[PDB]
Amino acid sequence: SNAASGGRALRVLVDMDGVLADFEGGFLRKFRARFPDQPFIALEDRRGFWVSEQYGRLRPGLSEKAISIWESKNFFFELEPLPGAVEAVKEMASLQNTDVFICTSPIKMFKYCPYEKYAWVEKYFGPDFLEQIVLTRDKTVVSADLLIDDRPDITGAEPTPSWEHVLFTACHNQHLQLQPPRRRLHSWADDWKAILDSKRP
């Protein structure tokens, strides 16, 4: 909930793919269904942020096939929420002196992805939550106290972002050793309120 007039709420950016929406599982399911005769990467064997790069090393032309899954209509809209995500973000947004924004990067092909991300937020959070969406390829130019995001390397035009990046665990990042004092949120069952509270006055 917003701070009282001109006052200062804790601001939390919550990433979408890999934090709210199960991109990795949705991708794998639809890849295997569309391309049943191709090899695939089990989630436990995922390494590195870019799915298409790992697929492209697996077999010639597989990068392009992988891309064709997330460029397809309904890919983003049909993603399942991660366990606990919707419930946690609803709770978070209801907290005193706490403003939550969903900060998400679209893919390069824009026919469906922006639209379906708005539709997905409406679906799980309601029409009023649409006001909290920030769609951007560069998250460093969005100011906040925290960014909860599964991407390990979050860079852009601002060399010194205002947020602390807390790495949300995903299959592709779970083995990564981070430079102290970087930290993780391991799942939505993990203690996200303690992380928020550590940044409060």
17 among known catalytic residues: yes
Residue 98, annotated as binding a ligand: no
d(CA 117, CA 15) in angstroms, rounded, equals 12
Closest CA to 117 of 46, 1, 19, 11: 19
* 144 lines the binding site for its own copies (CB under 8 A): yes
Alpha carbon distance 110, 132 (integer Å): 20
Interface of this chain with Mg ion, residues 131 to 150, rule: CB under 5 A: 150
Distance CA 92, CA 74 (A): 28
Q: What number of chain residues touch Mg ion (CB under 5 A)? A: 4
Instruction: Please check if 22 is assigned to a binding site.
Output: no
* Residue keyed to tokens 């997905």: 120
CA distance 121 to 128: 10
Q: Which residue, 8 or 32, has its beta carbon nearer to its own copies?
A: 8
Q: Choose, by CB under 5 A, the member of 71, 154, 174, 187 that binds K ion.
A: 154
50 annotated as a binding-site residue: yes
Element (DSSP H or E) covering residue 184: strand 183-185
Identity of residue 139: K
75 is in an annotated binding site: no
- Where does this chain bind its own copies (CB under 8 A)? 2, 6-9, 11, 99, 101, 106, 108, 110-112, 114-115, 118-119, 122, 127, 130-138, 141-144, 157-159, 162
- Where does this chain bind Mg ion (CB under 5 A)? 15, 17-18, 150
- Where does this chain bind K ion (CB under 5 A)? 154, 165
Catalytic residues: 15, 17
